[PDB]
């Protein structure tokens, strides 16, 4: 609904720690996600591979868990297959493949956190519309 505490608060790691994103992080997240991710994940979907969307439940069942800030930031640095067995930076934009995916060259740690925050917050605002 509105940017209330539960909407802005998401898991920071898989151990249970949480983080309450700021309104500024919320706005930065929308800007950055549109810039570097929307081309393939607009609205939470995943073009070319619909089943591996950005819905929170889908991320929670990924390996390692991607339903928390650290897990998503880690994915943006070193993306892996859903079972976490193989790294896929050559196909998936990441800091490790920033040479062939230029838009990733300009992302700071703070930017990565904001983008991760966007992914975890949106479904709480859009419900099923996300994904
Ligand atoms: C298209 C060229 C892409 C861009 C730009 C970004 N992502 Fe992506 N992402 C893409 C594909 C084809 C896939 C599936 C890869 C596979 O495992 O075969 C993904 C997957 C993700 C996931 C995992 C989803 C899940 O486990 O359910 C995440 C967390 C993800 N992508 C995040 C993400 C972010 C934050 C991006 C912007 C910085 C981004 N992706 C861009 C294709 C593309």
Swiss-Prot record:
Residues binding heme c: 41, 92
Keyword line: Electron transport, Heme, Iron, Membrane, Metal-binding, Photosynthesis, Photosystem II, Signal, Thylakoid, Transport
Single biological process term from Gene Ontology: respiratory electron transport chain
Regions that span the bilayer: none
Gene Ontology molecular-function annotations: electron transfer activity; heme binding; iron ion binding
Membrane-related topology note: Peripheral membrane protein
Record-level GO cellular component terms: photosystem II; plasma membrane-derived thylakoid membrane
Record text on subunit structure and interactions: PSII is composed of 1 copy each of membrane proteins PsbA, PsbB, PsbC, PsbD, PsbE, PsbF, PsbH, PsbI, PsbJ, PsbK, PsbL, PsbM, PsbT, PsbX, PsbY, PsbZ, Psb30/Ycf12, peripheral proteins PsbO, CyanoQ (PsbQ), PsbU, PsbV and a large number of cofactors. It forms dimeric complexes.
Cofactor binding note from Swiss-Prot or TrEMBL: Binds 1 heme c group covalently per subunit. PSII binds multiple chlorophylls, carotenoids and specific lipids.
Record's keyword annotation contains ATP-binding: no
Protein family: Belongs to the cytochrome c family. PsbV subfamily.
Name of the featured protein: Photosystem II extrinsic protein V
Cofactor(s) of this protein: heme c
Compartment annotation: Cellular thylakoid membrane
Effect of gene knockout: Cells do not grow photoautotrophically under low CO(2) concentrations.
Gene that encodes it: psbV
Function: One of the extrinsic, lumenal subunits of photosystem II (PSII). PSII is a light-driven water plastoquinone oxidoreductase, using light energy to abstract electrons from H(2)O, generating a proton gradient subsequently used for ATP formation. The extrinsic proteins stabilize the structure of photosystem II oxygen-evolving complex (OEC), the ion environment of oxygen evolution and protect the OEC against heat-induced inactivation. Low-potential cytochrome c that plays a role in the OEC of PSII.
